[model samples]
Target: NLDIIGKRIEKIKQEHETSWHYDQDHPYKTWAYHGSYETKQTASSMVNGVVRLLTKPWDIIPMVTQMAMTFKEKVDTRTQEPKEGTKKLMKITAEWLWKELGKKKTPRMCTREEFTRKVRSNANKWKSAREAVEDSGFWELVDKERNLHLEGKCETCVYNMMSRAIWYMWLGARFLEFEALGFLNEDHWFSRENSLSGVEGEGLHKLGYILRDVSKKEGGAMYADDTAGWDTRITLEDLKNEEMVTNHMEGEHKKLAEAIFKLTYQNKVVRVQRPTTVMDIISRRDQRGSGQVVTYGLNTFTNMEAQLIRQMEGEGVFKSIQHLTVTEEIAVKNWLVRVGRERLSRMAISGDDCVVKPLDDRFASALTALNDMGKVRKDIQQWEPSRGWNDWTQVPFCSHHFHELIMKDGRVLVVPCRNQDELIGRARISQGAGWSLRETACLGKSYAQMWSLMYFHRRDLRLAANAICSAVPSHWVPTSRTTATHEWMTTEDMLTVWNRVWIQENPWMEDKTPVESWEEIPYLGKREDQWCGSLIGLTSRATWAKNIQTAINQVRSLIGNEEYTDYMPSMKRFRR
Candidate 1:
């Protein structure tokens, strides 16, 4: 039976050899080896050796079982135990066809029909493998460079091994780790092929040659040194919030925005890469952890609000929430206030059916104090209760967002705090609650003290807010005394710092716009001056104090020694 298997394999090899020419150091280099040496090694040689080893009919089960047992023993006796642990085990099964001879016994491990079919299948796969390499313009390169040799180049060898590994991968083998070839397997390549390939065969050929001609040295390399975003790599790291915002605004100034707009709005067949996310295979591991389970529910409202605030801060389109115009700030604050009021109103309507407990005495007292201090505006009382949970509000936004990484599995699991945000929102709305549940439970803090502290620190916060709001207009007013100010620039106070700076003076622009020329432009309104000489008289003390503090610091640093004995009378005599 084994004899027939060898004969079948030999026949297929002969037919395959005749149909396809095997050249050295090309596609054939991976599958076959030919030279004047007596010894050779390759996938074909491995298959031949396999056929010669299994002499006693078919013993796949026996041979595999022996190998498994030997492997377990060898690993268990190693210097250090494996990360998967020392208790290694395996199970093997074999499907055999049984038959009997007249006066003796005969056994067959596998059928000659199955064996012949497999050999023919493998040979056919080789044809497709060769075609893949040819279609990649690999053959064209060889033809173009007639005298050039690929006998001993590192990059060429790496590519050959990668192509060979891909063929083995199609044949159901561990091709990724076969020679540390990484994620160059068929799945990743084909998934990205639509972007990599172009119209007809010309695009791929051009791309391949461009990469081929580029130097591999540190400095003049095209792919690695590319900072102009010409590279084909498109990872999560390549994504930017600025570009995302620009796309949302329907603009095409940035390269990312341009590419996206062309593909989406224009419906162009352009070469582009999409973000490739590696997905989770299993839902959960009891010993390890669970994966991200996105649920669509009413609570995602809080998440949306949190994301909005997050996006509005620090380099976001809105820049900083603190820098929002007074009107913009009022809009956001009113939305939050309305949500807080509605949440409490609903709780009051529920009566005894309420799941929420009554506010603690400390929380009630603080809310009373805030109301007395005029911090809680009466405008929220005019609003009536809404029927549904359609309000996109972020109330009592003091709770910490919770998420943890499972280092064992490299998973980030986020625990949504919508219900928590809601609870805090309602409590603060009803009686100005300020205690976090985690702080009370996890850190063993008194909830009553936490609630009391929220009101206790209001004076400091109030003073700081007053100081910040007072500083800006005073600075703008002083500048107005010298220049024509808003009466000339017309939009001085309205423009942001960057725009105001640019309109005044820039390295590129020359002959700044004349103040009187502003009247010539269409839609130009009659200019009016801010004229805040009297307002400065009312709040000039804070600005004067700021300047005095700076002068005091300068005088103190110049007079004092390293130990500052000049400032301290007791230490002055000892130090000198």
Candidate 2:
């Protein structure tokens, strides 16, 4: 026989759906009354329908009604304050059912005989036969028939019956456990005072089952005994193993190393330790210490740039204009006087009045004028000294005229230009050389000013070159050309010209024969003299020669002589 209780529940759900009002405007209130009444009607109808369909006429309707009434009473008690219309309907149904079977009389009811026989046949066919062959087959058969009638004979009836049986069995077992564990008295469903002690008691029963199952599965060993302690489980050894395995699986360790190297390279703030493997940096977090390591590595570039500037300043090839002190005041009168005296002194000593300095007054004047005109008290300092500048007086001339060459102790050699053309040309070559050497040599200055005068006065290089040449005699002026032409000159050509001019004009350029050949210039060889002259050495003819040679070498590397032939002829002596 099939159980109909679940069908009864389904009917309750259907009735509730049909009768309940779910108004958007007054959803809660409407649902409470209409919804509760509909649910009760549905449950009652399903229970009655199942009972009549499965039971005999002599079966006690009163007893069935009592059970149905109990279920309805439970629902009503659980949902106490039922709302309006549906609440009234549920009350009416209860009253009508009670009246139909008078208070003192018990009515008998049953299913049709044909229906009963059909149910019995189906139960025999569908119920598990293993139970029928067992010792408690009769009682099992009775229980199965009762459950079938209760849940209704349908696709889900067997499942529903089993589910209810499981629930009741669990509930009974829980109650027994509670009493056995002294968590509750034998008479208490929950606890003596209806407390939740039974739940606590049921936990002990669950623990016993868990222990039994675990022991059986594990061949008597406790699960805890087989496991390492939590601390030991995630030890450094384990982590190393995990990292090795995980890195292999991900195939990203190399990429990660590259990323870390790039980050360290770009961000000077990061410091990387020496003799450190890629794994060390890649595995570590970019924490304060790690960043410090990367920072140290990055500082190599900054220190290198500074060292270059210092070397230039010492040799007097490229001067950092910041080192030149001019006017502290807005008026150039004082600056002109100081600069004039300095230039006159340099001229008196060298016996050359045409030699001058290059000045970048944009930063100085703008800042001074702002302070003067705007009355801004920014506590700004003017004429900041740069390590690159050996002759502050040369600011009145072009920076190109002032050559900075690297020399002994990595200092710069400063040489004043004979005229504006020589200064401009030298400045251009220095700037271009700096550009080419930036990655390898790490020179930080811009090449734009060296290559073109447009950056200064928006004038063409040819016009600037002519004007510069006219400012001084032919003997004093050096030919000026574009970067393309300058790149074509070789270290040998530069050295030969440098030596020839040095022997005729300033013989000191040959004093330091650091290298025997032009080819040795790039490597600088084992001797200190072979290295590119410092900034301070640029002023001396011998150092200037070396500086020119170095610039030519750099240009050759950057643009290739074959491609840069146009600018090379400028170095040759030609009749005007």
Candidate 3:
């Protein structure tokens, strides 16, 4: 299948110089062959090369081009003779070429040696032209402009225009190269095989030459324009000095380390565009033939499976061997029969417990098992792996549920609580006699619980906090005091009091010194004496003392004693 397509492309190159029309004004000029003789010779060469590449003379006697033509004729009679367009043209060319080759008087295809010498001569001239252009001063301007753009100082409109121009120049160079190679290999037109192979080599050489010439000419033009724009010439010494400064500024010296670090370390959140799957390869072959079948298989097969088949013989586990059987079914069946007969003969000559029997059985078992496993594994993988979250009976959070808040002081905070309904009652609480006290002690216990709730309910913290604050008692309105002080007593303040009391009563922080620096305080840390720096900084001096006193009073109340019970007998004994 691959061989046939390659030959067809080669034939197109040989017989159809102007077969593919780029435009009415500029038709494909490489296809020099015309009329009967050129077409017959090119077609014959293509068929010969394709046949030689795909099959041996005795290999099951491949269906001839004549057979294909006959099939087409029969089909066409039923559905109007298939029009003599591209498809018909290809078929006719193939048939004619095959017949011409079969004729006794036809000459052998051109030798590789003769073709190479001809190609080399043309290639050298192109090479010389390219060298001449490169030596010219044209490219210097392009290099300068390209370097300037790299410096990030170019105007947006100018930069865009320059970029497009550069791209066009590159494409133009490529087109010229393609044309030059086609022209140089025009002599190989006597045979399709020689023309196809020879054209590609010749095209490559011409492309190189064109690139050389264009670069030099364009470079010189750019340089001349740049010189005209400038008042004086920039000598090599001046360029060197400028380059040295650029290198020093761009280099990784310790002085600019912080700036470089910020540039490099800053996390950029980029949303990449999804890749597009192009159907280019699909358009290369006919959809009606064996080529279509092969292409379909290639598209359906996993990359790994294709690689396995390409790299290893007899090891590929195809999805359906039946698909492969369509073409080689008879041949395979015959081979299997011969092998079976040989095995039977060997068994008859030996005993019932012959080694061949066990070996054959083992081989059959392995093959069946491998095929079954492949299918089963593919089926399982296709259903998608079970996510870890599937086992947990909880709703997951959306990543962007909360809004980010950047304080005027450059402090960025993300509040995850979104609403009161998602916050207050969401924390799972045990029902018991001391439930209220436990809840009070756990006051901010719901903070952690709120986090878990947020995870499950996917609430936004900023919204949650706002909702909770809005529902606060009128008497507990937030005070004007921004800092924590005695004057700013609120439910939250009372809750903090209760929390501190509970922490003090517990032995969680008995041996550790209380954290004084707000920075040293841990989130949800057990030590009541630990001060949260942010909280401390936000609180007033009066509020700070009031919070401490309230916490002390709460501790006394929990222990069933008066305030200052630390000075009493029972409390003193417990403290000691």
Candidate 4:
């Protein structure tokens, strides 16, 4: 049976190293005509190739011969037109077969009559390859045989039954070549019941082979290329039922949701509504593997390392690790000034509707420098005057209308606001805290996302920590608001902001690549390796976590705080 052919090839595979085992030059290199042919030359490929050829065995020989001819044409160096070396090709084919088949074989014991009986018995199962093709229902038997192979009931020592058939058909091809050499005489035979014909038909035929979408269509078999996306039967309702539209987004599920939603809705975009509750952010962060993050300066470490460090307790050389945050309100203001100077000045020049008063003299020099396309002088400060700062020369009826506040010494502040009420409330809260809403706290969510998305923007760890600590509210509970203590942002948080800003709807990193569907939003979760691997690879979860833990333990030994426990929680803690 074809089972033995597959089994033989597998046995050869494990017993000894083939040319594929080594990367350097080998005897099999010539047979490998394509760049990746050696890797592609698997038992499954050979089996599938044979099955494909057997769909119409009579024409397969010519097709395979044509493929070989094409290969030779590419490599041939002859000045004249290359000619087919039919006999010479057969000789090499026979030799290649001999090497694979080996020298030993069972002695010829069965008589011609017995062989005829066996052949006739095989013919009883399937009369001819052509008969199988004409009978569309004949595929049932093929699927059955393939299933038996899959269930490990078959004799083939290959990946599966399909692989066995491939080897068998390949061996049959060699035998046909030997027949031409007068080695043995036999009647015409085809890959009966074990192969397919035509490209699209074959591609569709295998869909059933794997027990996927296998319903018969009115127009016969459907090629995968013809149906290049999810089935039309899967509507948005079906996707919604699958819980793909959850507020707490999963990176992969979100992508899958987008794909399905685009396929269904056609025109509408898939947007996981922005997270609201603190639990929602934490849940989303957990999904991103960002919860329980620890930071040193701008260097963000993951939960695993955080747990590891905490478990180390008071034993390390460092009595208590001090987390230096982006507390420099002045530095944050300078950065904001540097980034938003032109835009803010233009907004002022155009008469910002939020502010009723005329432009103040405090901002005059800065506005002049910006309008002239020149630099704002080093000492001059720009104040919003809208945030109700006590020190700035206040303008009449300048109602507060800002979400972000950039502060300088003596209460001078430039507040960027969208709504008057929101600005007044934030200003009240900042005053209640006995502090001007100065410092790195000026960084709100939009600014953090905007700056992160800037072209060729690179930040020191401190700046990143500061921005994250300030922007990301206390995610410990459902109440998401600024607290006295700091909250470290996870690696997931950084990437999410990185990803979230790339949405086409968002003005910061508006995606320009035209899309046929809703929008091609770049996601940083799970898929960053391909899209932004180099950017995020250095501070990857395990990469940074492992490095941090190693350093901590090393320092533990050096500082005589070597006492440690190996207790660590499994990933199951994060799962629902």
lDDT of 3 at 367: 28
Per-residue C-alpha lDDT of model 2 across residues 296-395, encoded as one tens digit per residue: 2222212121222222232333222322223312122333233322221221001000111222212222222112111122223433322122333222
Model 4 Cα shift for residue 488 (angstroms): 10
Decreasing lDDT order of the candidates: 2, 3, 4, 1
How much lDDT does each candidate structure score? Answer: 0.20, 0.24, 0.23, 0.22
Report the alpha-carbon TM-score of model 2 versus the true structure: 0.15
At residue 431, give the lDDT of candidate 4: 15
> TM-score for each prediction?
0.13, 0.15, 0.15, 0.14
**Hey, what RMSD does candidate 1 come out at?**
33.7
Regions of candidate 1 where Cα sits further than 4 Å from its true position: 1-297, 300-345, 348-457, 468-576
* Model 2 stretches astray by more than 4 angstroms: 1-339, 343-366, 370-495, 501-516, 519-576
lDDT of 4 by residue, 92-206 (tens): 2223222222222211212323333433443224564434444545445443433433343321111111100111222121211122211111211101111111011121112
Number of colliding residue pairs in each model: 0, 95, 26, 7
Query: For residues 494-531, what per-residue lDDT tens digits would candidate 1 score against the true structure?
Result: 12322223234322224444222211211101120012
Q: Write the per-residue lDDT of candidate 3 for residues 138-248, one digit (tens) a residue.
A: 235333433433442211111000100111112112222222222222333212123111112221112222222222321111000000101011122211221221122
